[PDB]
Design a protein around this motif. Structure first.
Motif, mmCIF file in Angstrom:
data_model
loop_
_atom_site.group_PDB
_atom_site.id
_atom_site.type_symbol
_atom_site.label_atom_id
_atom_site.label_comp_id
_atom_site.label_asym_id
_atom_site.label_seq_id
_atom_site.Cartn_x
_atom_site.Cartn_y
_atom_site.Cartn_z
ATOM 1 N N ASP A 198 -35.443 -76.013 62.432
ATOM 2 C CA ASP A 198 -34.272 -75.209 62.228
ATOM 3 C C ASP A 198 -34.413 -73.839 62.999
ATOM 4 O OD1 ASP A 198 -31.769 -74.252 60.611
ATOM 5 O OD2 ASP A 198 -33.267 -72.419 60.151
ATOM 6 N N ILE A 199 -35.621 -73.376 63.127
ATOM 7 C CA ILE A 199 -36.076 -72.054 63.641
ATOM 8 C C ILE A 199 -35.924 -71.985 65.174
ATOM 9 C CG2 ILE A 199 -37.553 -70.026 64.115
ATOM 10 C CD1 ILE A 199 -35.999 -69.992 61.444
ATOM 11 N N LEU A 200 -36.541 -73.461 65.678
ATOM 12 C CA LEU A 200 -36.622 -73.585 67.079
ATOM 13 C C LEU A 200 -35.163 -73.827 67.660
ATOM 14 C CD1 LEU A 200 -39.890 -75.444 67.463
ATOM 15 C CD2 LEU A 200 -39.188 -73.026 68.036
ATOM 16 N N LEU A 201 -34.583 -74.841 66.733
ATOM 17 C CA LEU A 201 -33.035 -75.368 67.286
ATOM 18 C C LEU A 201 -32.287 -74.086 67.421
ATOM 19 C CD1 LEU A 201 -32.348 -78.588 65.012
ATOM 20 C CD2 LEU A 201 -33.254 -78.262 67.301
ATOM 21 N N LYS A 202 -32.225 -72.852 67.116
ATOM 22 C CA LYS A 202 -31.606 -71.755 67.177
ATOM 23 C C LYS A 202 -31.845 -71.188 68.396
ATOM 24 C CE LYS A 202 -31.534 -69.886 62.214
ATOM 25 N NZ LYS A 202 -32.826 -69.928 61.633
ATOM 26 N N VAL A 203 -33.018 -71.184 68.953
ATOM 27 C CA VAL A 203 -33.602 -70.745 70.298
ATOM 28 C C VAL A 203 -32.808 -71.857 70.952
ATOM 29 C CG1 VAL A 203 -35.423 -70.469 72.024
ATOM 30 C CG2 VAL A 203 -35.811 -69.906 69.321
ATOM 31 N N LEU A 204 -33.210 -73.325 70.930
ATOM 32 C CA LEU A 204 -32.444 -73.988 71.757
ATOM 33 C C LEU A 204 -30.909 -73.939 71.851
ATOM 34 C CD1 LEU A 204 -33.166 -76.662 73.380
ATOM 35 C CD2 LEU A 204 -32.862 -77.876 71.347
ATOM 36 N N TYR A 205 -30.310 -73.577 70.843
ATOM 37 C CA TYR A 205 -28.837 -73.300 70.702
ATOM 38 C C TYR A 205 -28.485 -72.490 71.910
ATOM 39 C CZ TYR A 205 -23.997 -72.582 69.084
ATOM 40 O OH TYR A 205 -22.670 -72.334 69.031
ATOM 41 N N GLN A 206 -29.308 -71.313 71.824
ATOM 42 C CA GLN A 206 -28.964 -70.362 72.784
ATOM 43 C C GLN A 206 -29.478 -70.390 74.170
ATOM 44 O OE1 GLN A 206 -27.204 -67.630 73.447
ATOM 45 N NE2 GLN A 206 -26.833 -67.732 71.302
ATOM 46 N N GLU A 207 -30.495 -71.440 74.330
ATOM 47 C CA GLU A 207 -30.747 -71.979 75.793
ATOM 48 C C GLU A 207 -29.616 -72.716 76.399
ATOM 49 O OE1 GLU A 207 -34.584 -73.491 75.007
ATOM 50 O OE2 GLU A 207 -35.652 -71.492 75.316
ATOM 51 N N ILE A 208 -29.019 -73.689 75.642
ATOM 52 C CA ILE A 208 -27.796 -74.485 75.857
ATOM 53 C C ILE A 208 -26.668 -73.648 76.071
ATOM 54 C CG2 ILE A 208 -26.457 -76.198 75.292
ATOM 55 C CD1 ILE A 208 -28.853 -77.279 73.542
ATOM 56 N N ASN A 209 -26.421 -72.738 75.243
ATOM 57 C CA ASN A 209 -25.279 -71.687 75.099
ATOM 58 C C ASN A 209 -25.328 -70.817 76.704
ATOM 59 O OD1 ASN A 209 -22.908 -70.551 74.454
ATOM 60 N ND2 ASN A 209 -23.998 -68.799 73.591
ATOM 61 N N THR A 210 -26.550 -70.441 77.190
ATOM 62 C CA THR A 210 -26.842 -69.738 78.134
ATOM 63 C C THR A 210 -26.662 -70.600 79.694
ATOM 64 O OG1 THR A 210 -28.148 -67.989 77.371
ATOM 65 C CG2 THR A 210 -28.417 -68.622 79.874
ATOM 66 N N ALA A 211 -26.927 -71.965 79.444
ATOM 67 C CA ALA A 211 -26.956 -72.786 80.728
ATOM 68 C C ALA A 211 -25.637 -73.063 80.927
ATOM 69 C CB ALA A 211 -27.750 -74.118 80.359
ATOM 70 N N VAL A 212 -24.943 -73.431 79.846
ATOM 71 C CA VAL A 212 -23.390 -73.724 80.135
ATOM 72 C C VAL A 212 -22.743 -72.477 80.531
ATOM 73 C CG1 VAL A 212 -22.585 -73.711 77.995
ATOM 74 C CG2 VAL A 212 -21.611 -75.285 79.357
ATOM 75 N N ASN A 213 -22.836 -71.146 79.939
ATOM 76 C CA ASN A 213 -22.304 -70.165 80.205
ATOM 77 C C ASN A 213 -22.428 -69.551 81.877
ATOM 78 O OD1 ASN A 213 -22.342 -68.912 77.038
ATOM 79 N ND2 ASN A 213 -20.590 -69.759 77.979
ATOM 80 N N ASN A 214 -23.696 -69.676 82.263
ATOM 81 C CA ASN A 214 -23.859 -69.770 83.735
ATOM 82 C C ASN A 214 -23.239 -70.570 84.737
ATOM 83 O OD1 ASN A 214 -25.634 -67.175 84.371
ATOM 84 N ND2 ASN A 214 -27.393 -68.243 83.450
ATOM 85 N N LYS A 215 -23.087 -72.028 84.235
ATOM 86 C CA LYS A 215 -22.492 -72.822 85.207
ATOM 87 C C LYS A 215 -21.001 -72.617 85.051
ATOM 88 C CE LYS A 215 -25.793 -76.735 85.325
ATOM 89 N NZ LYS A 215 -25.799 -78.233 84.752
ATOM 90 N N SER A 216 -20.326 -71.809 84.042
ATOM 91 C CA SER A 216 -19.062 -71.602 84.050
ATOM 92 C C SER A 216 -18.605 -70.550 84.549
ATOM 93 C CB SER A 216 -18.763 -71.986 82.476
ATOM 94 O OG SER A 216 -19.292 -73.304 81.830
ATOM 95 N N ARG A 217 -19.334 -69.467 84.791
ATOM 96 C CA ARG A 217 -18.913 -68.301 85.217
ATOM 97 C C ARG A 217 -17.978 -68.535 86.417
ATOM 98 N NH1 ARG A 217 -23.253 -66.471 86.399
ATOM 99 N NH2 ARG A 217 -23.650 -65.391 84.565
ATOM 100 N N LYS A 218 -18.232 -69.200 87.468
ATOM 101 C CA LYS A 218 -17.467 -69.428 88.679
ATOM 102 C C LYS A 218 -16.035 -70.064 88.175
ATOM 103 C CE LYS A 218 -19.837 -73.911 89.772
ATOM 104 N NZ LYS A 218 -20.990 -73.823 88.915
ATOM 105 N N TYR A 219 -15.889 -70.866 87.161
ATOM 106 C CA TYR A 219 -14.923 -71.586 86.764
ATOM 107 C C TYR A 219 -13.938 -70.439 86.025
ATOM 108 C CZ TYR A 219 -16.907 -75.843 88.364
ATOM 109 O OH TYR A 219 -17.313 -77.045 88.996
ATOM 110 N N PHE A 220 -14.611 -69.857 85.215
ATOM 111 C CA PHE A 220 -13.803 -68.742 84.537
ATOM 112 C C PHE A 220 -12.979 -67.828 85.480
ATOM 113 C CE2 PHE A 220 -13.086 -64.566 82.897
ATOM 114 C CZ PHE A 220 -12.285 -64.786 81.948
ATOM 115 N N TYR A 221 -14.036 -67.424 86.404
ATOM 116 C CA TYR A 221 -13.365 -66.334 87.427
ATOM 117 C C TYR A 221 -12.286 -66.903 88.229
ATOM 118 C CZ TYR A 221 -16.236 -62.364 85.644
ATOM 119 O OH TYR A 221 -16.760 -61.467 85.006
ATOM 120 N N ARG A 222 -12.566 -68.096 88.625
ATOM 121 C CA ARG A 222 -11.707 -68.963 89.482
ATOM 122 C C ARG A 222 -10.459 -69.105 88.795
ATOM 123 N NH1 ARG A 222 -13.863 -74.515 91.407
ATOM 124 N NH2 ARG A 222 -15.390 -73.185 92.385
ATOM 125 N N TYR A 223 -10.291 -69.379 87.415
ATOM 126 C CA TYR A 223 -9.128 -69.095 86.910
ATOM 127 C C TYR A 223 -8.453 -67.994 86.164
ATOM 128 C CZ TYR A 223 -9.566 -74.306 87.802
ATOM 129 O OH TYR A 223 -9.596 -75.554 88.246
#
Ligand SMILES: [Mg+2]
Ligand SMILES: [Mg+2]
Length: 367
Positions: A327-352
């Motif tokens: 449970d404790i690690l899955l919280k970190v993992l959630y944040q890592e996944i959130n950050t990964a996808v958020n970085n990949k998405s910055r371009k698309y956000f600003y683009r739109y």
């Protein structure tokens, strides 16, 4: 001639993927067990599942039960329902939401923030956050959310009351008989893991539209305030709802391109929910972590040391500690996944975002 430039290639290839078969199954096998009035004309699917998003996350449904069910009999009906669900090993009701503890309502005026920090415990957490001066109020509501919005476990419903902050007790009947909707958070096995089904019981003839506006407006704020560029695309999807070409690209980006990112975040959250709500066995907990570790390997270029620790925690131990560590690690993992996808998405956000009239940017973006 196939003597020559012939190759074959095929070759085949998991997590829950939408299929009309799945929908048929929940509608005919699950809904009759979890709704108050099953009846195609009395309920409506909403959200991602209504959209047939391929990486399925949840099923959100509304049950309009008035007048058959109203404040006159809503207590008796809900009690009957909880009893039935508690007797069904195949269906988990994690939480039933109904009512508010107004001692945690906002409306501003510093007096009351002190007057309501202090009903707490790690409430330095609240203060530690006071140090941030508005949007302060947003992360305060974030913190006291579960104090303000009453969540009931089946046990609490059946006993008929529960204990709140500062030795205040609240009664379940008074609560439902002075309210208008109830949120039933279920988990049912659909994948090879549990999926949450959210049922909203509307037992007055109330317009839910204002609740939709505010949830939308809520997701916007939540995404923007924490600069999560992935989620920041969700308002845009609504905004361009009527531009066919942009709608398809946003849908692709959100649901297909990065669909698995979202799905892994939900799946991890579902783990934490099943846990905290007391419904997580080590068998179930372990199966979920397995499928997660599997699917993490399909996020291109994703890396994390957490994966390793989750690997070692899997070793012997008590189910008790395994589940807690996970449970404790899955919280970190959630944040890592959130950050990964958020970085990949910055371009698309600003683009739109750049594609929306500067006047309307106010309502799709937060500076
Ligand atoms: Mg949904
Ligand atoms: Mg939902």
């Amino acid at each position: 001639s196939h003597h020559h430039h012939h190759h074959s290639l095929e070759v085949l290839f998991g997590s829950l993927i939408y299929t009309y078969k799945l929908e048929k199954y929940v509608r005919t096998k699950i809904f009759p067990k979890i709704l108050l009035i099953p009846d195609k004309n009395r309920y409506i699917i909403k959200g991602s599942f209504r959209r047939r998003v391929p990486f399925v996350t949840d099923i959100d449904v509304v049950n309009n039960v008035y007048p058959e069910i109203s404040r006159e009999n809503i207590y008796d009906e809900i009690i009957k329902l909880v009893n039935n669900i508690q007797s069904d090993p195949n269906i988990i009701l994690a939480y039933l939401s109904c009512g508010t503890d107004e001692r945690f309502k906002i409306s501003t005026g510093s007096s009351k923030e002190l007057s309501n920090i202090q009903s707490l415990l790690p409430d330095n957490e609240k203060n530690e956050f006071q140090l941030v001066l508005q949007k302060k109020l947003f992360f305060l509501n974030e913190l006291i959310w579960d104090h303000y919005k009453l969540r009931w476990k089946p046990e609490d419903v059946l006993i008929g009351s529960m204990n709140l902050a500062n030795n205040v007790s609240v009664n379940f009947r008074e609560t439902v008989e002075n309210n208008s909707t109830i949120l039933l958070q279920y988990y049912v096995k659909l994948g090879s893991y549990p999926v949450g089904i959210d049922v909203v019981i509307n037992y007055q003839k109330i317009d839910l539209t204002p609740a939709y506006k505010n949830a939308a407006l809520y997701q916007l704020q939540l995404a923007n305030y924490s600069r999560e560029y992935y989620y920041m695309l969700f308002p845009l999807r609504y905004y361009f709802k009527n531009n066919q070409d942009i709608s398809q690209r946003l849908e692709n980006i959100i649901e297909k391109k990065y669909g698995l990112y979202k799905q892994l975040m939900v799946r991890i959250d579902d783990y934490h929910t099943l846990y905290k709500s007391g419904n997580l066995k080590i068998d179930m907990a372990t199966n979920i972590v397995i499928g997660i570790l599997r699917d993490i390997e399909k996020l291109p270029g994703f890396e994390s040391d957490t994966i390793y620790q989750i690997k070692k925690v899997a070793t012997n131990n008590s189910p008790s500690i395994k589940i807690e560590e996970w449970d404790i690690l899955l919280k970190v993992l959630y944040q890592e996944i959130n950050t990964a996808v958020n970085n990949k998405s910055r371009k698309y956000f600003y683009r739109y975002i750049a594609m929306v009239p500067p006047q309307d940017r106010s309502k799709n973006y937060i500076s």
